[PDB]
Point group: D2
Chain length 249, copies 4
């Protein structure tokens, strides 16, 4: 079924995760045809500035994420940044997320595959679509069977990313495809998520937060919690009509 991975950018506090987990739990009961996965990072390991918020650590993060899975019965996903983190994170995470800049680190992919969990690799802004084939092959070699490739934009000049939707059908030849609606661009988020489902993908990825203008990360992009339902309904309707034309394989 269609996948909808959502949640706040960083684990600002397990309190915040519960508030968002509750709303995601509700949509979950409302859209039985969609599979929801709660997402949040225990650490922003690649911020541009050294003076930026990173998080409360791996343990506190895994802890809070457990609280969401236990209190709401939602599948979980977070990202790892170094091999060793794969095992402790697999304890709670149903899907292990590989950061875009790290989509080429062989040991990181192998470590994620070894846990037995599903793996979702954000496509590097530097990677060509056809070059994701070798990414998948690495993970398969590592024992991974449930593999996702996520579209998040490509380097277009300086400080700018463009979404080449030709990548969805191309990457689909070797793995399920997810579209990152918030990192690929706030005014262009919805327009582009509509294009993604019109083209065809196996799921969408959205960072959401109660009050984005106060979130300690991606405050200019995180989708306002209240708007999630309406966007999910919108893409399910477009998908229903457009799926009729999705090209085979």
């Amino acid at each position: 079924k269609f996948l909808v991975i959502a949640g706040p950018c960083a684990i600002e506090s397990e309190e915040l995760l519960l508030k968002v987990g509750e709303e995601i739990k509700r949509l979950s009961e409302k859209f039985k045809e969609v599979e929801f996965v709660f997402k949040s990072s225990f650490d922003k390991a690649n911020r541009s500035s050294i003076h930026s918020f990173r998080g409360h650590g791996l343990e506190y993060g895994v802890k809070a994420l457990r609280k969401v899975k236990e209190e709401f019965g939602l599948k979980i996903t977070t990202d790892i940044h170094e091999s060793w983190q794969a095992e402790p994170v697999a304890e709670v995470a149903d899907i292990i997320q590989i950061p875009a800049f790290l989509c080429r680190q062989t040991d990181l992919l192998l470590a994620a595959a070894k846990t037995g969990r599903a793996v979702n690799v954000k496509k590097g802004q530097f990677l060509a679509p056809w070059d994701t084939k070798n990414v998948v092959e690495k993970l398969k070699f590592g024992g991974a069977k449930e593999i996702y490739l996520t579209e998040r934009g490509t380097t277009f000049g300086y400080n700018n990313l463009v979404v080449d939707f030709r990548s969805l059908p191309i990457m689909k030849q070797w793995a399920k495809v997810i579209y990152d609606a918030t990192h690929s661009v706030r005014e262009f988020i919805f327009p582009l998520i509509r294009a993604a489902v019109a083209v065809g993908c196996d799921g969408v990825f959205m960072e959401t937060h109660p009050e984005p203008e106060k979130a300690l990360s991606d405050a200019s992009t995180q989708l306002p919690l209240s708007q999630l339902e309406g966007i999910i309904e919108a893409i399910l309707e477009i998908r229903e009509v457009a799926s009729k034309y999705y090209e085979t394989i």
Copy 2:
């Protein structure tokens, strides 16, 4: 507002070819009555890469052939001009004058088109940013143009490659009606999916080159859409447009 579908053979290879495509377009116009069709074809491919490539049979022949289509099917006409002097003669038949991508900044060509009183459709250059089309429209209004279209046809992305930045659709929509060129922005395997993306995002129309037998065409044999496939593609985009339409954001 009525969705626009601009389609036809890339080049006016012959008045016969034109009459064959026009016949189908006329049939589809009768079927898809909520669509406003415009028959398109160039009397000259003035910018081919090789000096040895097909160009056309002259402005005279082309305009006469287009006049035949309009006359025989009552279809609106559009064709592109390359130099200022061609605006006047072309305006005698074309309902919409098209400005080529590479020429979107040539002030005199735009002004020549605008004074004819006919509608003008400017293809966004592969070198231009979305927000820089504002001045393009301004030149047109300055020159008397009342009906203006901007067509998205891809952007330079490295060498020999064009990417479509769909954020351009809502940006350009701020100052003009927006058309999506499904055939030049891509190879044929991506025409359909990207056209689906265009209508989901939201545009005022699509532009498609179509030919009875693309493999024999004198230009764009690799990208022209087989005429038999036109109907289905049109039905699909109308379907996707409708279901996505309630979510189109206000400019």
Copy 3:
């Protein structure tokens, strides 16, 4: 010999052209090993805004340009924008310049070739280096024998141009190569002109003006007249040393 095409962006007045022609005349007598060509446009036919300065017309321009060639004995060059202009312009211009956006207009290239003069085609920001081969072939077919291709940057994201110096040796396979130092980028003008001669080119193209901050065009890029000599001396010295390593053909 090495070519140095210089002059003010637009023909603001024949007075301005004489002032610049005088200085170019002087450098001309000082650098006998270099061939100088006076450049200036009679019309800025492709400005972004309709409310921008375009010029004083073709006749007034051809007139003034004649005054420079007669009063200083300098070769002349200006650009055309439509076929018909080729003949009247050839009267004075030793080299006919084709605008970058127009490097693909077959009739414009043929019209320029027909006059018998030399032709210099600015490489479109949208063109790949290897694709200039067909540009040259068009001109040869048109009867042109002295052909130049000019590097002026390539589209790099939005509102930005990058200079891929790999184009110089590539384009050199079929035509002499000129480097446009002022349109390819003011702080980066000199650094890049140095790279161009280090790599190898047949000449440089520079827009210069007495008081750039008052020029009715490219006021943020035009090189200050007073600085021309020092830059010419600099590139001749680098060339002298670097030419030893220029690859054959």
Copy 4:
């Protein structure tokens, strides 16, 4: 200031290969005494595209082989790390710790390198803008790094292509010493010309992968420079640098 030349085989295929290249580099260091040479080679290619490609013989073997070079030729050493834990062991031999292009933003890796006290050279990611390296250097200084280098290795330009925007050299020079990677920025036919451009613009050093027989290398067989060609290339850039040096602008 002394020009830097960082060169060596891409991968530590064997301690023998290393000793063979080191011998030549030592010879050139004796000749070009105004140059500061640094022997480079990776103990692991942790980011190859294919799982079936050569990676290395382990950190243990690599560090021991590099220690051999320094020991036998008195040459400075540099190698790249991939995870935080490798900084400590690697710092026991490397005079300069290299940060891979794809990892230039991984805060912990940079901090790990900086605390060792060794110099750090960060390869500018193909996704990074020149001006965004300011924060890279800031992280390093924050972490205790006193000697910092930024290496230009090309920028993403469409798919499967990298362009070198030489304006980056003076921009990055504002906050750190700048090195030009002649071999990864390009294929071999453009190595020489672009390296000439780098020194004319102005940089503090060059980085070149070199191998006795590139066609047999276990990595970058297409771009590694034949060892026999190293001397001439170095002489040329020193010549071009000198004549262009008086025109280098002040930061």
